[model samples]
Target: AECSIKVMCRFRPLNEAEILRGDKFIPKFKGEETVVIGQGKPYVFDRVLPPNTTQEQVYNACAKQIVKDVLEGYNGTIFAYGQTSSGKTHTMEGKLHDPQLMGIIPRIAHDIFDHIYSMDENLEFHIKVSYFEIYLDKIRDLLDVSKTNLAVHEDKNRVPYVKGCTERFVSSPEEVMDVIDEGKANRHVAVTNMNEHSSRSHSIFLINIKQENVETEKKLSGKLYLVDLAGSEKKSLSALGNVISALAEKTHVPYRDSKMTRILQDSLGGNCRTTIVICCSPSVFNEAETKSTLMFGQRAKTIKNTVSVN
Candidate 1:
């Protein structure tokens, strides 16, 4: 069986009991409609979710389906988008250290590791991870380990290439996490009117899985993408200074502005099994911003050519 990508929506105040009691869940302060960007066809809310649910829950659900029925293969990509101050980072990375609060990325690591350890003795598995960032149309390798200022050049196909930072390959899940921490520290985040720790650039983390069953001699390989996109912002609303104001437009300039956003155009504009999680605040005072976010979701749904696994 081929791996399948699933879409799910999560609302805030997951504590049903608390929600019923009027315990205002900060998580739902923005409401559920914030991340619904439009694409080729409007997305059918395959399911609705409650906010505050750990990322692990969401990823495990998909993994179960991806590997069901047979010793099949699967790959997945999860990304969060919307205006700055939304919940993209919260959803992708979530709170660290709290096993009860692990995000989708960490959950994936645990799952794959457990599966590898429990498999038949003859089975072989390989796992590798790489992290990189795109800022102002330039590519920077985040997990260089060597702390080198790598250079990137565009290929004829317009793909950015690092002088010495070609994607790194590894075999240990620990290494993956190490690189993640390294990359996280190096990411460019700054304070903004919307989010105090707002991410200033797009971040991509790639996980490669290769497995071979000795008994069946079947080879399986899958690549998973976990992306945390910088949030969009409106200058007037954000009350941003000249720098951030300029960055606000730069953040959403699409293919023309940022190399990473441009290269991933296929994924964002419709070329892969893309699921967009748009985050927003629901304060009545933010009505204009909220409506703008919904409109963005509508456009995302119009993106076409998403290749779904059968």
Candidate 2:
């Protein structure tokens, strides 16, 4: 099978306050591409979701297939990246449990368990989930904050793994939701000048699935990663630029430059199918940040990862 990294853009509608201030921008979309009017630059992606697009639409456009790939014994990842208050969080984790508004993460959990149960009765399935955050270049377990400095090490295969992180065994989708909720409560959130409740760190939620053919004694293992990257700041932008440069040059990626990049080495540039959802705001007031985000997304589009079944 052939594999390639996918990139997509999503424009979030301006909030009530921006509308009250009469702030807006017109984006021109031509199928799976978009260009910010007056920016004189166009970006091509796997898909371009409109501002009024629903959560379900976003999932169907890019994420649903990755979930299906996981069931087929391939590692997959979905992550949202953008500036502060640009809808990364909302796109990854919308109003919890709201069927119409539930974001990609919850929907992914639902689909995973649903597929498992719908399989042949002779097969056995087991799932384990772990949640963690990378803040100030430190890796912290969201399920147990006490493990604030979890070590990230690579196995003989060069696949990164977090040691000493909490991984809870789950049997149902409801239990998975509970685990997500508990981890969310422990994530690092702080008020910033741009975003009132901005995520201060990059949060990663990992699902490990194992299947066993009871009679055949055959086994399959798959991993799914859902990442909510911290909003890009001036300092972080510099780090991102370095990583992009490395990717373009086919040199050693500077994953060790930041905890977020280091922990995501496998998903971002290693042996996994990856999708990057570039979130953006449709507001004139955020033009500069929006442009920066667009550039980041464009640079990311050039990256290629050799993905294969795990």
Candidate 3:
């Protein structure tokens, strides 16, 4: 059987005003317009015009719906995809251990734990997390493993597979945070012309979940893919020297060549359940970067993938 992947696009204002737009090309006003993208109805996220209010406020409302889907036996993944300096990190990684700052993953973790505890003694649950980075086309596992160069392979099922990767089982949200911190520490970073805290690699933190009905012994498993993509840098904006240029070229390598991309081929190519957060600083200096970001987002909504459970 194949997995069904459903995508939801969450749009936010690039600025306090709508003079410019993010990667999402939603209509300026809120009435029925085909500018948005979803299954049947056009999907749209508005900062002001809506049946609701703020961006986060709308996200919380949607999270409740996501929670219901998860509770009813569905695997979910929330990803933030956009250009560098965009709000991908802020919206996805969020502030330190703060629910308000926490992205969709942390919120989902909180909900999962709460539900498990509420159903205590009736359900047996296990959660595990693993983090890794693909840098200069090299695969580095983040949790308790020797750094090794690994390649991405595809299985008969056509899913991307990376050997030498590691997964760590966890029992609490605190544990998840601790591992996340460790992975963040191990993540590759370098001072470059474009970004001071620029991430020169693509990384993923996978959460494997297993559930069992203690009474009936029925079991199910799921994967929650929480990803914060490395911000991309243009040679001109970054003022790249030869070395930096090489690094930039290298950073873009795995996004096309590596197994991670192959595994994520669907997501990037619009074949998986995905959500893109296009982040941009409201600064006049970043206008070019902003336009580039929106262009990428516009292209993203058209890629197709199967959005079902495996």
Candidate 4:
């Protein structure tokens, strides 16, 4: 199925705090899908979102189509990648209570259920979700933090899934948010070294959907994965660059080399539609990380994930 991954880059405006430190917009905007960094060559992407782009607009631009594909019985993944405080968190989990500031995942929660409701009433649906916290190469079920040290397992199709993660049943979007709320209740034990604990860990929020047409006695299944990656820094993620590089060059890609890549093996290269969002800060202060993120996105552009519809 050879579906090329859709990679987009987004810029977050320089905040007052950054202004206090005298930061300048180092990245030059070139239009919808092109941007230049500090007088460098313009890098193009599937989509380019400026700092002013609204959360809703971000979802519409980067995520809406993946959800549609999920409903069509294909797996979909949307993950935010960047350094700490570069707007990855804001892009994935904004102020959930406010409709205008709500994150991409919650919006999907609502829209997916809305889509299910509008479909044939005879089509019964079971929407289940799971959340995991991967810190220091260990997989822990955020839904049940006590459940730790889980392993990635492969099925008959070589599809990798967590061995002991908690997968909870959710009926409505409210239930989905409630589950997110509960999972979020138990997170980040070590925040001493990490500025914000989010950068120290990666989280994957998963939705498993199965629908049945009672009249025809037919059923279909789809899995949607929303990942809020641990921000890449000097530490942690030589493996990912290796992965993107490894993927761009076809070989025995060492998905086994990186834990996150292994967990995402299904979505990254097979049977899934993956959207990679590289969040960036416009300020010159973060120029190094900004360049790193852009390079990652560029490498990802050369990679492809073939998808299949059940």
Q: Write down the lDDT of every candidate, Cα atoms only.
A: 0.52, 0.79, 0.53, 0.84
Native-referenced Cα lDDT, model 1:
0.52
TM match of model 2 to true structure: 0.92
Q: Write the per-residue lDDT of candidate 3 for residues 1-310, one digit (tens) a residue.
A: 2332223333344454434533333323345321322222333332212322343553564344545444545555565555664556656666657755566656666776777677758668777777876555567787643666866765576656566677777777777778888776655332343244345555677776777888988877665666666765562112112212222121342334444555555444322445544454444445455455544444444443455443
Worst 10 residues of 3 by lDDT: 235-244
How many clashes show up in model 3? 15
Q: Which structure is stronger by lDDT: 1 or 4?
A: 4
Off by over 4 Å in 4: 188-196
Candidate closest to the true structure, highest lDDT: 4
- For candidate 4, the 10 contiguous residues with the lowest summed lDDT are 188-197
In model 1, the Cα lDDT at residue 50 comes to: 50
Comparison by TM-score, 1 against 4, better one: 4
What TM-score would each prediction reach against the true structure? Answer: 0.65, 0.92, 0.68, 0.95
RMSD of 4: 1.7
Candidate 2 contains a number of clashing pairs equal to: 0
Tens-digit per-residue lDDT, 1-310, candidate 4: 7878889998889899898888788877777899998767788999999988899999999888988888888889899999878888789878876899998999999889888889977979888899987778778889987788888988777678887778899889999998889887776444444456666788889999888889998778888889898878773366667766788772877777767888787777788889899999888888888778998999888888777776
Q: What order do you get sorting by lDDT, best first?
A: 4, 2, 3, 1
User: On residues 147-167, what C-alpha lDDT tens digit does candidate 2 reach at each position?
Assistant: 788788887876778888899
lDDT of 1 by residue, 123-159 (tens): 6877666777544445567865344345555667554
